[PDB]
């Protein structure tokens, strides 16, 4: 099935509090597996995911220095922006970037991205044609003319179309036993009193990995959606997640309500009823 | 390995 390798880069200026923080965090299927932090014991790319242990020393030192380079790189970027933006050094700002590629079960290349965000905002990004540029404001433009005219798109596309993929594939080969393992949700309902002789019953989904998952309540057949309660899935602590949905119902009607639980680790969706 | 970004 489709997979991907993204890299979340980030650097925040520290006007007064020393050299701004810069971080590099990679992800395979949104699974952090490796990171570098300018503010750790001794900044270095380190293995997050356990299967990374299969890479040797060269690997680390390599990315590590790469990091060190990229670090300085953005450090200046900070200034640059301040310039396009005529900002007062004083306050602090932030830069984040989305680097990654998506491949199919064939090995073909689904999509390639490069997203530049300043102070929680879209600054500039590579189109899907992996050749042009999309700016956001005056600033980005100056950054486009300049960017493009250095052959930027080209070298970028190389990585995406190629490097990115040689690795994404490599990683997978070493961490499949992990990556797409299965953890089944354990559900159950709970009934809660409420004034006016009504009630809320909320459906629980606990102990499940991955995290994507939809859950519903049904009008004994209809899409009981328009009026419910949902909570962004949440990280348990041991790699699993949790989530619940619910709504009010009149007493003596509970049992006439069905909850459904959809999760790729379920041989069949789940049906809860009070 | 991640890319090797170029200035803004």
């Amino acid at each position, epitope marked *: 099935g489709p997979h991907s390798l993204r890299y979340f880069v980030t650097a925040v200026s520290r006007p007064g509090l020393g050299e701004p923080r810069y971080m590099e965090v990679g992800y395979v299927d949104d699974t952090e597996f490796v990171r570098f932090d300018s503010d750790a014991e001794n900044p270095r790319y380190e293995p997050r995911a356990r299967w990374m242990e299969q890479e040797g020393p*060269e*690997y680390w030192e*390599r990315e590590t*220095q*790469k990091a060190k*380079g990229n670090e*300085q*790189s953005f450090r*200046v970027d900070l*200034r*640059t922006l301040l310039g396009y933006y005529n900002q007062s050094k004083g306050g602090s700002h932030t830069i984040q970037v989305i680097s990654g590629c998506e491949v199919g079960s064939d090995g073909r290349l689904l999509r390639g991205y490069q997203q530049y965000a300043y102070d929680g905002c879209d600054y500039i990004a590579l189109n899907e044609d992996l050749k042009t540029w999309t700016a956001a404001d005056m600033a980005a433009l100056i950054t486009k003319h*300049k960017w493009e*005219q*250095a*052959g*930027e798109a080209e*070298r970028l596309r*190389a*990585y995406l*179309e*190629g*490097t990115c993929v*040689e690795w994404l594939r490599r990683y997978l080969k070493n961490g499949n036993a992990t990556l797409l393992r299965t953890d089944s949700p354990k559900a159950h309902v709970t009934h809660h009193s409420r004034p006016e002789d009504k009630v809320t019953l909320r459906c629980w989904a606990l102990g499940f990995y991955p995290a994507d998952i939809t859950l519903t309540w049904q009008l004994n057949g209809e899409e009981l959606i328009q009026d419910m309660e949902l909570v962004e899935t949440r990280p348990a602590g041991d790699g699993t997640f949790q989530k619940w949905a619910s709504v009010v119902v009149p007493l003596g009607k509970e049992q006439y309500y069905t909850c459904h639980v959809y999760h790729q680790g379920l041989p069949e969706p789940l049906t809860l009823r009070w | *390995s991640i890319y*090797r970004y*170029y*200035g803004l």
Partner: T-cell receptor
Amino acid sequence: EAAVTQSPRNKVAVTGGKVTLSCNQTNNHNNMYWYRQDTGHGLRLIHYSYGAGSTEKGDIPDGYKASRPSQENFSLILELATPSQTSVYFCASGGGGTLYFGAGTRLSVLE
Amino acid sequence: QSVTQPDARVTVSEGASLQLRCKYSYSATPYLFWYVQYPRQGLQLLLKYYSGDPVVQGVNGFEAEFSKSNSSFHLRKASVHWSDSAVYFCAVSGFASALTFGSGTKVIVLP
């Protein structure tokens, strides 16, 4: 155009000397370098810069001091000279990985 | 980020084929390049092989194939012709932006 200027072109001076071989830029590349061409080793890097205010060491920095005032200009310094330093330099820019070298410079450091 | 040209000086009859051999050591796939140094000139760009296809098509019969198999970016040609006698530099770029050159090769074309 598409190129990098590097002047003075030829320069000679006695030890202890101090010159400032400059370099201009008509190609908005952020990066900039200073290599040292000598027979036996080929080009060797001393100092490069990712833009204004940036100056990061290279492989042979001792005796040299780079300075990145403005995106366009990049220059090398040699407070105290030395005939060991006699050679042909080139500053170079490079918007990514495609470097662009300049004419060059003949500095002979006679005693 | 290392590079190594095994021969410092090559010589071949005009109109013949050319073999400029490079080698390197980098635990990954460093960027590869080929430059030409003429008489009173500055390095000129002939190639760059970022990734993908191991055979690059550069200006004037110059092409080089990359080879992770035996780590090498040899710039070769078919019928080298006089105006092409000069010094060629192989070059890589990994950890950081700057290039890393090899001693280089001095090939000569007997007309």
